Design a binder for this molecule. Structure first.
Ligand SMILES: *[C@@H]1O[C@H](CO)[C@@H](O[C@@H]2O[C@H](CO)[C@@H](O)[C@H](O)[C@H]2NC(C)=O)[C@H](O)[C@H]1NC(C)=O
Ligand SMILES: CC(C)CCC[C@@H](C)[C@H]1CC[C@H]2[C@@H]3CC=C4C[C@@H](O)CC[C@]4(C)[C@H]3CC[C@]12C
Ligand SMILES: *[C@@H]1O[C@H](CO)[C@@H](O)[C@H](O)[C@H]1NC(C)=O
Ligand SMILES: [K+]
Ligand SMILES: [Mg+2]
Ligand SMILES: [Tl+]
Ligand SMILES: [Tl+]
Lengths: 992, 39, 268
C-alpha cells in the first residue's frame, strides 16, 4: 500500500511556463476562472490531508482481556459460576464461595486489563502535525484579481502568490519571483534559505529552484507560481500519509511478554487437564472435578505478574523523566537497551544546528576556536595584535545584531537577526572580545557596500576609534581567493609586510585544510586610508568606486561549520563500546556529512571509503577492491537507483556508514534495511524529514528543544534538554530493567509451586486441603506485590555497557533456566516448608501425619460432627474446619517466610549478597510491609470471615524458617559455583 | 489441677491478637522509616 | 531431543534424583523432631475441642431425619447407623475384669485412675449396658434417637448447681452427679421421653475423665436414648437437644457445640 510512497517523486519543472499551463488549463496572468476553480475542486477534491482510520479505544481495551492469563482466569471465573449454578439447583447451598470467587476473578481480569492497556499505549498524532503546516488561507489570482481564499479551496492550475512570512499552500511551479528565498528544512532538515526563481536549475525537482513545496515557508521576497499538486498528492503530503500510515508493530519487550505467557499458559493447561482426568479416574464427581480445576487455574496463573511488569516499567520511566528524558510509550523504556543499531540524523541531533566559527588563520598559523554550547574547550590566542585586527573586521564588517531582551540567555543560544555566517562571526567576537555593539559605537560606520553576488565581498568604512588618528579605516570580507587578489601586505604578528609567494602558498595550504574539514572559509582584510588623501569630511561613494579596493592588507582567514553538540562525540563512542552500530542518515550534502562523521566518531581515524583509497593511490575507483574500504558515504541520488538487496550488501559490508542527501522515504528505507538483517534499530532526529524513519524505528527518539512538532509526534521518547548523553543512559537503563524483570519474574513464579502442590497432594493423598484458593490470591495480589516490584531498583551486577546487545532470537526474558530454578528447585523447597507447617498445626491439635491419609472423605463430611483424631477425641464439623483454615493461614505465612529468602536470592543472578549488599531500600520496605500485611491478615478481627484467615500462635511463624534458610544457603552455594567456573554446567543450567 | 483443670482447654486468643496487631503496626512503622530515608 | 543431548538429559536426572532425595530426607527429619516433641497419651493442644460437641446416631441428611411409617425401606437407612453404634455396647464385648469394671448402677462421682502415664496397664473403664436404654429394629414410628457427648481426654464435665433458676426447674435434679439433656422445639407438638443410666436424663459422671485411646482402648462413653412419641404427623419439627453444665457452651456457627439440630418428620 505504502510501497508507492517509499519511492522518489516525478515532476514537471522541466516544462516551459506556457507548456505547464496547457497541462493544467490555466492562465499565467489572469489565473483560473471562479467557475473553473470550483469545477476542479469537485473533480480533484480539497487541498487537505485526511487522517488515517484509527482503532477505537474500546477494541484496544478488550483485546487485552483475552491474552493467555486472562483467558485462563476467565475459564476459572465462569467455572466458579458453573459450580455455583450446579449447587443452587441440587442442594441449596447458602454459601457464597463460587459466586464471590467468580466475581473476584472477573475483577482481577478487568483490572489486569487496565495495566496492559496502559502499557500498550500509542500516542500518535502525525497527520495532525502535518495539517498544521497548511495555512488557513492562500492568495490566488482568479479572473485577473488577487483574493484570499480558504487554502483547502486551492486546486491544481490556479495562480498563487507568496511573500516573506507565509507558508507554501501547495506544491507550486514558480513562474515569477523577486528575491524569493525559501526554508526547505521540511525536506532536507537544513534551514538555510534557498532561492526560488522561474528558471529550471536541476534535473532533480527536490533541488531545482523553480519548484516550491507544501510544508515549507517563504523567508523573504515574493513569488508567483502555478499549483501542480494539492493535498495528499503533494511531495510532503505523501510523506505525511507514509508516516501516519506505517504499521506500528510489536516491541521487543512486548514479544518477550507474550513468549512467557505461552510457556506458563502451556504448563497451566497441561497440569490443568492432566489432573482433571487424573481425578475422574480416582472416582471424583464432576461437581468436585471442576472445583479442583478452578484451584489449579489460580495456582498456575501468576495473577499479579503482568501488573508488576507494568509498574517496574513505569518506575524506570520516572527515573528517566528526572534526567530530562520523556517516555511517551512505556515499552520504549526497554527497546533502547536491546538496540543494536542507531540511525541518526545530523543537523539538530548530532549537531547544534548553528553556524559557528571553528578555526582562524592568522600569523601563518591555524588556530582552533571552541565550538561547544557551554564552551567546554580552551582559548586559542588573545595576545597577537593580529587577532585584534581580525577581530575588529569580524565585528565591524558585519550587519548582524542580537534580538532585543536576550541579555539573560548565553551568547551562543540567543536569537540573531542575520544570515548564518554573520551570526557566527558576531557570536565569536562577542564571546572573546566582549560587547560587539561597543566596537560598532567606537568605530562609527560612514559608508558600506553590502555583500554582492558579483563583487563576492563586503566592505565598510569606519571612523577609527583611536583619538590620535580618528581617521578612516576600510574593512572587507569575502571569498578567500577574491580577498587575496586585493592584498599587497600581510599583518604578521602586528607589523605589515609584502605578500611574497611564500605566505601566499601557506594561505592556499591553510585554505585547503580548513575546506577539507567541511568548513566554510572566509577571507578578511583591511586598509588604513592615507590621511592627507582623505579629510575628516571626505565623502565616500558606495555606488561608484570612490576609494581604493586593491593593495589592501590581508589580516586572516576564518572558518565555520554547524558543529557537534558537546556530548555527542563521547556518546557515540559509548554506544560503539556497547557494541551498537552507529549510522548517519542526513538530508545534508556529503562533504559536510562526512566531516561531522569523523568529528563525532561515526568514521574512526584511518578508515577509508573507496574514493579515499583511489585519491591516495591516485588510481581509478573501479581499480579499488571495495572490501578494502570499511567506511562508505552514499549520496541519495545513487541510493535511488539501488535495489534493497544492494542496500543490504552496503549495510553488511561496512562498519562506518554515512547516508547523505537522503530524502525522508530514503531514511525509512535505510531503517527497514537494518531491521531486515534482524537488528533492533533506534532512530534519533529532530526534523519533519525524520518522521517516517522515527515511526518505523523500533524506538524513535526526538530532540525536545530543537525538534519539530512532527518529529516529536513520531517518536517514542523525547530528550527535553537535547542532551545526547541521554541515549547512553537510556540504553543502560534499558539493559538494567531487562535483567531486573527476570529477577522479578523468577521471584513471582517461584511461589506458584507451593500453591500448586497442595492441590495435587489433596487429590493423590486424600488429606485435608492444605491451602485455599482465596489464600493464593492473598499472596499473588497481596504479599508478593511490593517485593516483586522492588527488584526493579536493583543496581547492575557488572558493567552492562561492556557487553554486546542481546540477541532477541536467543536471549529471552524467560527461558528454560528460569523455570528450572523457580519451579524445579526453589519453589519445590517452598512447597515442603508449606506442608511442614501444615503437618505441625494438625499434629499439635491431635491429628498426627499418619492418620491424615485418606481422611478427607470424613473430614469434609458436613454431617459427621464427631471425627476421631489420633488421640481418640471427637471433633464437630466447624471445629476441625477452624484448624484446617488455621492450616491455610500458616501455609500462607510459610510462603511469606520462604519468600523472604527468595527475595534476597532473586536480588542477584551471579553475584553474592555479600558482594551486592542490601542497599535497595524499596526491597527492605517490601520485606517489612509484606510481613506487616500477613500479620494483619491473620490477627485482624473479622478476617476469619472475609478471607478465612485465623490467628497464628507465635511458634507457628517459625515452622518454615529452616526452609527459608536452606534456600538462602543453596542459592548462595550454587552462585558460588557459577562464579568459580564460567565453564558452563551450573551456568548453562540455572543462570536465568 | 485435678477436676479443676479448666485452663487446659483454654487459650488467650484475645491477648495474642492484641500482641499480633501491635507487632504488625510496629513493623509497618519501621518499614516507613527505612523507606523514607530518602523517599 | 527437545531440550538437550542424552548426556545432558542424564545429568539433569542424576541431579534431581539426588536433590529430591535429599529434600525428602530433610522433610522426614523435620517430621521426626516434631513427633519427638509430642506425647503418646495426650495432645499438645485441646482448646479447639474444648466445649464438647453433642452428636447422635441417626445419620442426618442435613440435620434432618424424615421418613414414612407406612413404608419399610423409608427408615432402614437410619437404622443402619443406629445399629452401628449400639452394636459396640454389646455385653459380649465387655467380658471379664479386664479391661472393664462394674460401676454404680446410679449416677456417681468421677474416677481418677492416676495420671496420663503408662506406669499402669490399660486404665479400666466403666461398663455400660445398652439395656439401660429402655424401649430402644428400632422405632418404626416416632424415632428413638441416641445422644452422645464427644470424648475429650482429661475432661471433667461439671453439672450446673441448683443455686438459681433452671430450664427444667429442679425436677429430678441430681445436682452432684448428672449432666442433663433437655430437648425442645411454643411449637410444643410432641412428647419427650428420655432413657439412660440410672433412669436419669443425663450422663453419669463415673465415666470421666477419659484417658485417651492409647491409655483406654475398648472404653465406653455413656449414651442417652431419647424418644419422641409425638402425637403429630406430616410436618417438619425442629427439635433441639441441649446439654447443660459449667464446662458446656454453644456457638451460633457450630450448631453441634453441646447441642442437637434434628428435623424429624413422620410423613406417613
Ligand atoms: C451386638 O448385638 C447385636 C444385637 O442385635 C447382635 O445382633 C444379633 O445378630 C445375630 C446374627 O445376625 C442375630 O441372630 C441376633 O438376633 C442379634 N441379636 C442378639 C441379641 O443376639 C450383634 O451380632 C452383636 N455384634 C457383635 C459384634 O457381637
Ligand atoms: C509434585 C512433584 C511430584 C512434581 C515434580 C515435577 C518435576 C519432575 C518437574 C518440575 C520442574 C521440571 C523441570 C523444569 C525445567 C526443565 C528445563 C528444561 O530445559 C527441560 C525440562 C526440565 C528439566 C523440567 C523437568 C521436570 C521438572 C524437574
Ligand atoms: C416401651 O416398651 C415397654 C416394654 O418394654 C412398654 O411397656 C411400653 O409401653 C413402651 N413405651 C412406650 C412409650 O411406647
Ligand atoms: K517507532
Ligand atoms: Mg535534523
Ligand atoms: Tl498463582
Ligand atoms: Tl506466585
Amino acid at each position: 500500500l505504502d510501497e508507492l510512497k517509499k519511492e522518489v517523486s516525478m515532476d514537471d519543472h522541466k516544462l516551459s511556463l506556457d507548456e505547464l499551463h496547457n497541462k493544467y488549463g490555466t492562465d499565467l496572468t489572469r489565473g483560473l476562472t471562479n467557475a473553473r476553480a470550483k469545477e476542479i475542486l469537485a473533480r480533484d477534491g480539497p487541498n487537505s490531508l485526511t487522517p488515517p482510520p484509527t482503532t477505537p479505544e474500546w477494541i484496544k481495551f478488550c483485546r487485552q482481556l483475552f491474552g493467555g492469563f486472562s483467558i485462563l482466569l476467565w475459564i476459572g471465573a465462569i467455572l466458579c459460576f458453573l459450580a455455583y449454578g450446579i449447587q443452587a439447583a441440587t442442594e441449596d447451598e447458602p454459601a457464597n464461595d463460587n459466586l464471590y470467587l467468580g466475581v473476584v476473578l472477573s475483577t482481577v481480569v478487568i483490572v489486569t486489563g487496565c495495566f496492559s492497556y496502559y502499557q500498550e499505549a500509542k500516542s500518535s498524532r502525525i497527520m495532525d502535525s502535518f495539517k498544521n503546516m497548511v495555512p488557513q488561507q492562500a492568495l490566488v489570482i482568479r479572473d485577473g484579481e488577487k483574493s484570499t481564499i480558504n487554502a483547502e479551496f486551492v486546486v491544481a492550475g490556479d495562480l498563487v502568490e507568496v511573500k516573506g512570512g507565509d507558508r507554501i499552500p501547495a506544491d507550486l511551479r514558480i513562474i515569477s519571483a523577486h528575491g524569493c528565498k525559501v526554508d526547505n528544512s521540511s525536506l532536507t532538515g537544513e534551514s538555510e534559505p534557498q532561492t526560488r526563481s522561474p528558471e529550471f536549475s536541476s534535473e532533480n525537482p527536490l533541488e531545482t529552484r523553480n519548484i516550491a513545496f507544501f510544508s515549507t515557508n517563504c523567508v523573504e521576497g515574493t513569488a508567483r507560481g502555478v499549483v501542480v499538486y494539492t493535498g495528499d498528492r503533494t511531495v510532503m503530503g505523501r510523506i505525511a500519509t507514509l508516516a501516519s500510515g506505517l504499521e506500528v508493530g510489536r516491541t521487543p519487550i512486548a514479544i518477550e511478554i507474550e513468549h512467557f505467557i505461552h510457556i506458563i499458559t502451556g504448563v497451566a493447561v497441561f497440569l490443568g487437564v492432566s489432573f482433571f482426568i487424573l481425578s475422574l479416574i480416582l472416582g471424583y464427581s464432576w461437581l468436585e472435578a471442576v472445583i479442583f480445576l478452578i484451584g489449579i487455574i489460580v495456582a498456575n496463573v501468576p495473577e499479579g505478574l503482568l501488573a508488576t511488569v507494568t509498574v517496574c516499567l513505569t518506575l524506570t520511566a520516572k527515573r528517566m523523566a528526572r534526567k530530562n528524558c520523556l517516555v511517551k510509550n512505556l515499552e520504549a523504556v526497554e527497546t533502547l537497551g536491546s538496540t543494536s543499531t542507531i540511525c541518526s540524523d545530523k543537523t539538530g541531533t548530532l549537531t547544534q544546528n548553528r553556524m559557528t566559527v571553528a578555526h582562524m588563520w592568522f600569523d601563518n598559523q591555524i588556530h582552533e576556536a571552541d565550538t561547544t554550547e557551554n564552551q567546554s574547550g580552551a582559548a586559542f590566542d588573545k595576545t597577537s595584535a593580529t587577532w585584534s585586527a581580525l577581530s575588529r573586521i569580524a565585528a565591524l564588517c558585519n550587519r548582524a545584531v542580537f534580538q532585543a531582551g536576550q541579555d539573560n540567555v548565553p551568547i551562543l543560544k540567543r536569537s540573531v537577526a542575520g544570515d548564518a555566517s554573520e551570526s557566527a562571526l558576531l557570536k565569536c567576537i562577542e564571546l572573546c572580545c566582549g560587547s560587539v555593539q561597543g566596537m560598532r559605537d567606537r568605530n562609527p560606520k560612514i559608508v558600506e557596500i553590502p555583500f554582492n553576488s558579483t563583487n563576492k565581498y563586503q566592505l565598510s568604512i569606519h571612523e577609527n576609534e583611536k583619538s590620535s588618528e580618528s581617521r578612516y579605516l576600510l574593512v572587507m570580507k569575502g571569498a578567500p581567493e577574491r580577498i587575496l587578489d586585493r592584498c599587497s601586505t600581510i599583518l604578521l604578528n602586528g607589523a605589515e609586510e609584502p605578500l611574497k609567494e611564500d605566505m601566499k602558498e601557506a594561505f592556499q595550504n591553510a585554505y585547503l585544510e580548513l575546506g577539507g574539514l567541511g568548513e566554510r572559509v572566509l577571507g578578511f582584510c583591511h586598509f588604513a586610508l592615507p590621511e592627507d588623501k582623505y579629510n575628516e569630511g571626505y565623502p565616500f561613494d558606495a555606488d561608484e568606486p570612490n576609494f581604493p579596493t586593491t593593495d589592501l592588507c590581508f589580516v586572516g582567514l576564518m572558518a565555520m561549520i554547524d558543529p557537534p553538540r558537546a556530548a555527542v562525540p563521547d556518546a557515540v563512542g559509548k554506544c560503539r563500546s556497547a557494541g551498537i552500530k552507529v549510522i548517519m542518515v542526513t538530508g545534508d550534502h556529503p562533504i559536510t556529512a562526512k566531516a561531522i562523521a569523523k568529528g563525532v566518531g561515526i568514521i574512526s581515524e584511518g578508515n577509508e571509503t573507496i574514493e579515499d583509497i583511489a585519491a591516495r593511490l591516485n588510481i581509478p575507483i573501479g581499480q579499488v577492491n571495495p572490501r578494502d574500504a570499511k567506511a562508505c558515504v552514499v549520496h541519495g541520488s545513487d541510493l535511488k537507483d539501488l535495489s534493497t538487496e544492494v542496500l543490504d550488501d552496503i549495510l553488511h559490508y561496512h562498519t562506518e556508514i554515512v547516508f547523505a542527501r537522503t530524502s525522508p522515504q530514503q531514511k525509512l528505507i535505510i531503517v527497514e534495511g537494518c531491521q531486515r538483517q534482524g537488528a533492533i534499530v533506534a532512530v534519533t532526529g529532530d526534523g519533519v524529514n525524520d518522521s517516517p524513519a522515527l515511526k518505523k524505528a523500533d524506538i524513535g527518539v526526538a530532540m525536545g528543544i530543537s525538534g519539530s512538532d512532527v518529529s516529536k509526534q513520531a517518536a517514542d521518547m523525547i530528550l527535553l534538554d537535547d542532551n545526547f548523553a541521554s541515549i547512553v543512559t537510556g540504553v543502560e537503563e534499558g539493559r538494567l530493567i531487562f535483567d531486573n524483570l527476570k529477577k522479578s519474574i523468577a521471584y513471582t513464579l517461584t511461589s506458584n509451586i507451593p500453591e500448586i502442590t497442595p492441590f495435587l497432594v489433596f487429590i493423590i493423598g486424600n488429606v485435608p486441603l492444605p491451602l485455599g484458593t482465596v489464600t493464593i490470591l492473598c499472596i499473588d495480589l497481596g504479599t508478593d506485590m511490593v517485593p516483586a516490584i522492588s527488584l526493579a531498583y536493583e543496581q547492575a551486577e557488572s558493567d552492562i555497557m561492556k557487553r554486546q546487545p542481546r540477541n532477541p532470537k536467543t536471549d529471552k526474558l524467560v527461558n528454560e533456566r528460569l523455570i528450572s530454578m523457580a519451579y524445579g528447585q526453589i519453589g519445590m523447597i517452598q512447597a515442603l516448608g508449606g506442608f511442614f507447617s501444615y503437618f505441625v498445626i494438625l499434629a499439635e491439635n491431635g491429628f498426627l501425619p499418619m492418620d491424615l491419609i485418606g481422611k478427607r472423605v470424613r473430614w469434609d463430611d458436613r454431617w459427621i460432627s464427631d471425627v476421631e483424631d489420633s488421640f481418640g477425641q471427637q471433633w464437630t464439623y466447624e471445629q476441625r474446619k477452624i484448624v484446617e483454615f488455621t492450616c491455610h493461614t500458616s501455609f500462607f505465612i510459610s510462603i511469606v517466610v520462604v519468600q523472604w529468602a527468595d527475595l534476597i536470592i532473586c536480588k542477584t543472578r551471579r553475584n553474592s549478597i555479600f558482594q551486592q549488599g542490601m542497599k535497595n531500600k524499596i526491597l527492605i520496605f517490601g520485606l517489612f510491609e509484606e510481613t506487616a500485611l500477613a500479620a494483619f491478615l491473620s490477627y485482624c478481627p473479622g478476617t476469619d470471615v472475609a478471607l478465612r484467615m485465623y490467628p497464628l500462635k507465635p511458634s507457628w511463624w517459625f515452622c518454615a524458617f529452616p526452609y527459608s534458610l536452606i534456600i538462602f544457603l543453596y542459592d548462595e552455594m550454587r552462585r558460588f559455583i557459577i562464579r568459580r567456573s564460567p565453564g558452563g554446567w551450573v551456568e548453562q543450567e540455572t543462570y536465568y | 489441677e485435678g477436676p479443676d483443670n479448666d485452663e487446659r482447654f483454654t487459650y488467650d486468643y484475645y491477648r495474642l491478637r492484641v500482641v499480633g496487631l501491635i507487632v504488625a503496626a510496629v513493623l509497618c512503622v519501621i518499614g516507613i522509616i527505612i523507606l523514607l530515608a530518602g523517599k | 531431543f527437545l531440550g538437550r543431548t542424552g548426556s545432558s538429559w542424564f545429568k539433569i536426572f542424576l541431579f534431581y534424583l539426588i536433590f529430591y532425595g535429599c529434600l525428602a530426607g530433610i522433610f522426614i527429619g523435620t517430621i521426626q523432631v516434631l513427633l519427638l516433641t509430642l506425647s503418646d497419651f495426650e495432645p499438645k493442644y485441646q482448646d479447639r475441642v474444648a466445649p464438647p460437641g453433642l452428636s447422635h446416631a441417626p445419620y442426618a441428611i442435613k440435620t434432618e431425619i424424615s421418613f414414612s411409617i407406612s413404608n419399610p425401606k423409608s427408615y432402614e437407612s437410619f437404622v443402619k447407623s443406629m445399629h452401628k453404634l449400639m452394636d459396640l455396647y454389646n455385653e459380649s464385648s465387655q467380658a471379664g475384669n479386664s479391661p472393664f469394671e462394674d460401676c454404680s448402677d446410679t449416677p456417681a462421682d468421677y474416677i481418677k485412675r492416676g495420671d496420663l502415664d503408662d506406669s499402669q496397664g490399660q486404665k479400666k473403664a466403666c461398663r455400660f449396658s445398652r439395656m439401660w436404654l429402655k424401649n430402644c429394629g428400632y422405632a418404626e414410628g416416632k424415632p428413638c434417637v441416641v445422644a452422645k457427648l464427644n470424648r475429650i481426654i482429661g475432661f471433667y464435665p461439671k453439672p450446673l448447681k441448683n443455686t438459681t433458676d433452671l430450664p427444667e426447674e429442679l425436677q429430678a435434679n441430681y445436682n452432684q452427679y448428672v449432666l442433663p439433656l433437655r430437648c425442645a422445639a411454643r411449637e410444643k407438638i410432641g412428647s419427650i421421653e428420655y432413657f439412660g443410666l440410672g433412669g436419669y436424663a443425663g450422663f453419669p459422671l463415673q465415666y470421666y475423665p477419659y484417658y485417651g485411646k492409647r491409655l483406654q482402648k475398648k472404653y465406653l462413653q455413656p449414651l442417652l436414648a431419647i424418644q419422641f412419641t409425638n402425637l403429630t404427623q406430616n410436618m417438619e419439627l425442629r427439635i433441639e437437644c441441649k446439654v447443660y453444665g459449667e464446662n458446656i457452651d454453644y456457638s451460633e456457627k457450630d450448631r453441634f457445640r453441646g447441642r442437637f439440630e434434628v428435623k424429624i418428620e413422620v410423613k406417613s
